[PDB]
Ligand binder design. Structure first.
Ligand SMILES: NC(=O)C1=CN([C@@H]2O[C@H](COP(=O)(O)OP(=O)(O)OC[C@H]3O[C@@H](n4cnc5c(N)ncnc54)[C@H](OP(=O)(O)O)[C@@H]3O)[C@@H](O)[C@H]2O)C=CC1
Length: 323
């Protein structure tokens, strides 16, 4: 993956496309749906795909990418693929084995990016959400800094080109960077980010430490049951996004997307519909003026669509802190 892309440069020297297609799905969808959407995204010009072991779509996402490679549409070297290790496998001795598993599902030799999915470990086992009889997740205690060293080991094994974190707070990022004998800084922190939760402080913090912020929930999230309060407001129905979309001759979505791009953020997106997937690629075509950027900074309202509420009582729930 070389410099001839709309890409930013990670602190390990590697390139990441700034617009990524997300491969998580609503509960209501078969997992094969991800094969279909990946083929569509590739044809629309997407090169960056984001996934996770817990998504359980990596095997279908791999079929889709591999058939596009086979038929000559793309090369592996022009695809940027991310996975994430899930809470059940954060123990140092389980991190690599989880990555080897995903590579086997994918039939890939490496992933371009591998993240800690959440800074919170759960009871190890095949079950992704181990619970007790009250329906409550079983937390486990892990040294996150030991998890980090196992990540670094995955990078020096060639299993992943870069390593980063997802859903870390300021204090949790510090932990890692201040860890003695640190070999690689996280290249990114993938966190929810939209006009209702604009992450100004964590963005500024990540920038100061050469950490790329990669945003999900750019469009208000797919609202997954039950991660998202079904009575939170729908981001893209927000009047000022409608107003600005008319002004610029776009839609609410494109305005949301462009807002993040102009902030130096790497942006994820998912749609189940082909024509949206094609539409999201128009983000590259137009500029929002700086007074309009300030307008959108004003929507900030601490509306967190995915607080990972099922984790609330975890020693490490990242979302208590201001940022
Ligand atoms: N790191 C983490 O912990 C997490 C990471 N993720 C990642 O983020 C990716 C993106 O998902 P998420 O953040 O939930 O969803 P987004 O915020 O990217 O999109 C939200 C909604 O926007 C709609 N939409 C997309 N394009 C348009 C458009 N052009 N016009 C109108 N509506 C549009 C989609 O609906 P529709 O399908 O109806 O078109 C979708 O439900 C995931 O696939 C996964 O990679 C997700 C959650 C957590």
């Amino acid at each position: 993956m070389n410099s001839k892309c709309h890409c930013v440069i990670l602190n390990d020297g590697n390139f990441i496309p700034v617009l990524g297609f997300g491969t998580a799905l609503p509960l209501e969808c078969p997992k094969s749906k991800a094969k279909e959407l990946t083929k569509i995204a590739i044809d629309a010009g997407f090169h960056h795909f984001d996934s996770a072991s817990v998504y359980n779509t990596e095997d279908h996402v791999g079929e889709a990418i591999r058939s596009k490679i086979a038929d000559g549409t793309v090369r592996r070297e022009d695809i940027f693929y991310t996975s994430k290790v899930w809470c059940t496998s954060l123990h140092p001795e389980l991190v690599r084995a989880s990555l080897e598993r995903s590579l086997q599902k994918l039939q890939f030799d490496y992933v371009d990016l591998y993240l800690i999915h959440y800074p919170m470990a759960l009871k190890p086992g095949e079950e992704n959400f181990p619970v007790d009889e009250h329906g409550k997740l079983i937390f486990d205690r892990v040294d996150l800094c030991a998890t980090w060293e196992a990540m670094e080991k995955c990078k020096d094994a060639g299993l992943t080109k870069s390593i980063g974190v997802s859903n870390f707070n300021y204090r949790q990022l510090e932990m890692i960077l201040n860890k003695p004998g640190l070999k690689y800084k996280p290249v990114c922190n993938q966190v929810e980010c939209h006009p209702y939760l604009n992450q100004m402080k964590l963005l500024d913090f990540c920038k100061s430490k050469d950490i790329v912020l990669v945003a999900y929930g750019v469009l208000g999230t797919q609202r997954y049951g039950g991660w998202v309060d079904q009575n939170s407001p729908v981001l893209l129905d927000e009047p000022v996004l409608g107003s600005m979309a008319k002004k610029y001759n776009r839609t609410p979505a494109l305005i949301a997307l462009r807002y993040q791009l102009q902030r130096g953020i790497v942006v994820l997106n998912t749609s189940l519909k082909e024509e949206r997937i094609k539409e999201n690629m128009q983000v590259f075509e137009f500029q929002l003026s700086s007074e309009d950027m300030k307008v959108l900074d004003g929507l900030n309202r601490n509306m967190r669509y995915i607080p990972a509420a099922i984790f609330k009582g975890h020693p490490n729930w990242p979302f208590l802190d201001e940022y």
